[PDB]
Symmetry: C3
Subunit: 213 residues, 3 copies
Amino acid sequence: MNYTKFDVKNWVRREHFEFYRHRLPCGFSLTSKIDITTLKKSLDDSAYKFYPVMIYLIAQAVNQFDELRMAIKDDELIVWDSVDPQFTVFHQETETFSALSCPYSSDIDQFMVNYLSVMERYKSDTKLFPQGVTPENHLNISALPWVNFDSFNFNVANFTDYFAPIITMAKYQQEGDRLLLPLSVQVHHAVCDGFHVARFINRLQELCNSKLK
Amino acid sequence: MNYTKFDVKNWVRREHFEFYRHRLPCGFSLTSKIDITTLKKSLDDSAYKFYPVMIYLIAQAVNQFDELRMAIKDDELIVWDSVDPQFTVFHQETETFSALSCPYSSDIDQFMVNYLSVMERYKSDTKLFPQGVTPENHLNISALPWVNFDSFNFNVANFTDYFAPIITMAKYQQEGDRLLLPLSVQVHHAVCDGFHVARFINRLQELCNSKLK
Amino acid sequence: MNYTKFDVKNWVRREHFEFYRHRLPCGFSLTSKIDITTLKKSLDDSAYKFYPVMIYLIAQAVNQFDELRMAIKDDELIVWDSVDPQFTVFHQETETFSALSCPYSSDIDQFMVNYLSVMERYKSDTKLFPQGVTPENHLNISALPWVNFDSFNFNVANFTDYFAPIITMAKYQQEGDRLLLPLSVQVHHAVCDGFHVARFINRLQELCNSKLK
Ligand SMILES: O=C(N[C@H](CO)[C@H](O)c1ccc([N+](=O)[O-])cc1)C(Cl)Cl
Ligand SMILES: O=C(N[C@H](CO)[C@H](O)c1ccc([N+](=O)[O-])cc1)C(Cl)Cl
Ligand SMILES: O=C(N[C@H](CO)[C@H](O)c1ccc([N+](=O)[O-])cc1)C(Cl)Cl
Ligand SMILES: [Co+2]
Ligand SMILES: [Co+2]
Ligand SMILES: [Co+2]
Ligand SMILES: [Co+2]
Ligand SMILES: [Co+2]
Ligand SMILES: [Co+2]
């Protein structure tokens, strides 16, 4: 299979996992600003577009840390070998959105081909899920390109055992010499502590500051 | 009546509405900064005060978009022809607040008269709801003038079917050449997507940048 | 005992207390930036370290306002004479955290001795609660020193009657001439209004701007 059953009995976080899963169930969200000044220049020197690149980079960073790819399957804790991005697409015509997913690839060029191909095929489909069921091994990404925000939070009436991270980006803005992008990350505390979120964000910032290929 | 039953069967969002109402019930909040540099000058050239003007402008913008005036009445989805602001008033003497409402009017001067008249009559009343029941066709506005914030979120134990937007403003602050006001908007995802919130905020920013009358 | 039963029948907030406790149960969070430019200089001129000092100052400010030290005990509303900080400690070795508490003292030097002594004794203990049960009269403080944030919120599946404030700080950052620290405060609306939170934050800012001793 594409997942491994995680060894909960010998995990250093086993007490935290039961505590935040069942004793005091909770998740948290944080919004931080990533510096995309360097990424903007890399983009300027290429034919890639902003949204797909951010999807790629967020998926790449998630795909590096196990704690962001956990799930309960058959009542057991597993880690997906890899997760694919599920992202939102806006339809100008109806002013509604759809969620699509495409296979992740560590090759940026192959990722771009997967993306354009899904986009090609469902750009006109207004169902909420044009592809049908969401793949179990997913991460959620969404964008609000029309407004800048300093904070974002989802208030969900039930999030029991749902461990996939939720990432939302706003419109970026010029903050003196820098171009900053607000990014909100929302996770379940059973699998992620503040350290793990900070580590994901720091790694995404480094990827934004590195060559695309 | 002062509302119309909305046509859910032919709505482009009908799948989203059932999905966020019953399958995955959720709302979200976002905080963004509005530039009130121009409004401050308009205020300086007038006798209007800041709080009542912001109430007016927020109500005016809500009153322009249907998705911000939805409600369930008799198990059906309706749109109010118009909504009146319900806002908080602080009592210095007891250090407690009350919530009041007054009729909205597209005439700023008539709005100011409605406001001062409600204020006149209940400035000393410390009940939480001095007027008695809140009008069904309302929007909630509150202000925290004592502190600036970058984020605000309400954690509500039950928000089933409550679709009126919740707007909270903080103390404004000087951010170089500009005067910025933090404004938090919290909505139910069954009736509002990120696009609709961004559109409300963009429209409020334009109103702040326009003549009062 | 170390608490007093509060007089609910004659409280100016009695209607608000029942309303937010049982009619519309809710809490809120806000994140604001404290200016720690002066505190940094006081720290520079001393041997105290940042984390313990912030713990001290947050506890000192909480200990001044009754509404931040409320609890339900034996079905009655009480006010603790004083509360002790419960704070998080990160273990680099396992990349996990523990929560510890130590007695509050209005003498900064005695507080530092209590802190170092608890730290000495449990620095290697990876249990979530090395000391065993959390003291009932507590406040929660946590820190995310690895990342700066503009917002933070806990999404808790059940917060019935839990009135102790939750305070989270991020990594501080230089914002022109100032050093700012993001601080998130999350409270239950039955005991705290926006005014009370703003008053706590304003008082903490003054303490940060004053001599340590
Ligand atoms: O609602 C969805 N996505 C939103 C898009 O803004 C977000 O990414 C999200 C995902 C899961 C979620 N949850 O599970 O509570 C809430 C929001 C997909 Cl399920 Cl369609
Ligand atoms: O509590 C109220 N208002 C607060 C004021 O800060 C806010 O505007 C609000 C409104 C509704 C709400 N809700 O329905 O969950 C929560 C907060 C009115 Cl009901 Cl009194
Ligand atoms: O979880 C805890 N603390 C976190 C630390 O980030 C936070 O301070 C907190 C405290 C209580 C809480 N609650 O009661 O819902 C949630 C988070 C202590 Cl119970 Cl271990
Ligand atoms: Co259990
Ligand atoms: Co791998
Ligand atoms: Co249904
Ligand atoms: Co109209
Ligand atoms: Co009751
Ligand atoms: Co005292």
